[PDB]
Curated annotation (Swiss-Prot):
Transmembrane segments: none annotated. Component of the RISC loading complex (RLC), or micro-RNA (miRNA) loading complex (miRLC), which is composed of DICER1, AGO2 and TARBP2; DICER1 and TARBP2 are required to process precursor miRNAs (pre-miRNAs) to mature miRNAs and then load them onto AGO2. Note that the trimeric RLC/miRLC is also referred to as RISC. Interacts with DHX9, AGO1, PIWIL1 and PRKRA. Associates with the 60S ribosome. Interacts with BCDIN3D. Interacts with AGO2, TARBP2, EIF6, MOV10 and RPL7A (60S ribosome subunit); they form a large RNA-induced silencing complex (RISC). (Microbial infection) Interacts with ebolavirus transcriptional activator VP30; this interaction prevents TARBP2/TRBP binding to DICER1 and thus allows the virus to counteract host RNA silencing. The modification Phosphoserine is found at S213. This is Endoribonuclease Dicer. It comes from Homo sapiens. Coiled coil: none annotated. Belongs to the helicase family. Dicer subfamily. Changing Y178A: 10-fold decrease in activity.
RNA sequence: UCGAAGGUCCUUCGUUU
RNA sequence: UCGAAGGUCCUUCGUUU
């Protein structure tokens, strides 16, 4: 069985021009990170011209490039990749797609699978490690247990602490809000707080980067969602880093282009 | 994100002697 | 006339910190 291994090139050719960025938000170039995604096929791919996807950070050019050709490796490895492809499309999102990393040539990511398979308290308190949350996706443990919500860590607010003033009038402090509503007590009252961002699955080929009722309401919801400030002790860190996650959310748009 | 309700129209069927 | 089952779209609301 002949195999063909493609890499999905992501390079930011047109960053926000810095006139267009009024708010001077951080830019997240895809080329700054070595971990990417590839497509695995049986029959090769009919050459596709390179195309843009429009993200918050700018115009990102997608190039489908052939990294390796003609090989094949076992069956169990062929079967394992499928579990990652599912994981990407079922658990992360909602012929084969797999993670790659640098060795200056590219191979299948060795550190991907065991973060997840690494994931199978307390009286002495939660400890805040700044390097944990640097590139991170966090989920709140205290709500939405069915389908947990996930956020990028946008900022670490260092002057803020769980005893800082809660933004809404009904509560004095974050400590109080979480105690009152969720019955949660914090073991660490000196920890900073986290700013978040969220995007997930939409179409990136055009630039939203006449609304109905159901959509005008999600506009407000998404808006408030991004203004949320979260508590690190009350949040779990997702194994897949935010940097790889940002590449992952372009996959539906990119795979759409290859089909059409 | 997950839900709730009101309305509107369409499809399929029941209902009379 | 009164109903059943399924769907479409519009509108209103809850849900986050």
């Amino acid at each position: 069985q002949p195999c063909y291994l493609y890499v999905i090139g992501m390079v930011l050719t047109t960053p926000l021009p810095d006139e267009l960025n009024f708010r001077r938000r951080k830019l997240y170039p895809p080329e700054d990170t070595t971990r990417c995604f590839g497509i695995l096929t049986a029959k090769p791919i009919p050459q596709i011209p390179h195309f843009p996807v429009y993200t918050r950070s700018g115009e990102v050019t997608i190039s489908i490039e052939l990294k390796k050709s003609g090989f094949m490796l076992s069956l169990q490895m062929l079967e394992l990749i499928t579990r990652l492809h599912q994981y990407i499309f079922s658990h992360i999102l909602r012929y084969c797609v797999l993670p790659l990393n640098v060795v200056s040539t590219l191979d299948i990511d060795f550190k991907f699978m065991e973060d997840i398979e690494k994931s199978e308290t307390k009286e002495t308190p939660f400890v805040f490690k700044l390097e944990d949350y640097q590139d991170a996706v966090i989920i709140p443990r205290y709500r939405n247990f069915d389908q947990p919500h996930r956020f990028y860590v946008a900022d670490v607010y260092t002057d803020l602490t769980p005893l800082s003033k809660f933004p809404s009038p009904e509560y004095e402090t974050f400590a109080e809000y979480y105690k009152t509503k969720y019955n949660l007590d914090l073991t660490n009252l000196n920890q900073p707080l986290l700013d978040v961002d969220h995007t997930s699955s939409r179409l990136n080929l055009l630039t939203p980067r006449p609304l109905s009722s159901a959509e005008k309401r999600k506009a407000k919801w998404e808006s408030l969602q991004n203004k949320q400030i979260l508590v690190p002790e009350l949040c779990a860190i997702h194994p897949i880093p935010a940097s790889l996650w940002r590449k992952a959310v372009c996959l539906p748009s990119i795979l759409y282009r290859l089909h059409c």
